[PDB]
Each structure stands twice: as structure tokens, then as C-alpha cells.
Design a protein around this ligand. Structure first.
Ligand SMILES: [Fe+3]
Length: 51
């Protein structure tokens, strides 16, 4: 799945993960740490919408 940061437009792609911030590819959004935030704008998970 992809999820979009409603603040900045960043797309969290679960296939890509977010390895620079400790997230391996294939990590589902729901598996992201509570303290993970948009690596662009720092918005919390609450500001993401699933596409
Ligand atoms: Fe953002």
C-alpha cells in the first residue's frame, strides 16, 4: 500500500519502507513505530491517508 502525508505530499510506500529512518522495505504502515513521522515534514502517523 501507499500512504500519503496529507501535510506535505510525501508518499510512504510500504514496498520501499523508509530505511534511512530504520524501516525496512515491506513494512506496513500499521507496523511503523508509534514514534515514526513523515521523514519530510515530521507529521505524525495520524496525518497519513491510505491511497
Ligand atoms: Fe509530510
Amino acid at each position: 500500500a501507499k500512504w500519503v502525508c496529507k501535510i506535505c505530499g510525501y508518499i510512504y510506500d510500504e514496498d520501499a519502507g523508509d530505511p534511512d529512518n530504520g524501516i525496512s522495505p515491506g513494512t506496513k504502515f500499521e507496523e511503523l513505530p508509534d514514534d515514526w513521522v513523515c521523514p519530510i515534514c515530521g507529521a505524525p502517523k495520524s496525518e497519513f491517508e491510505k491511497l
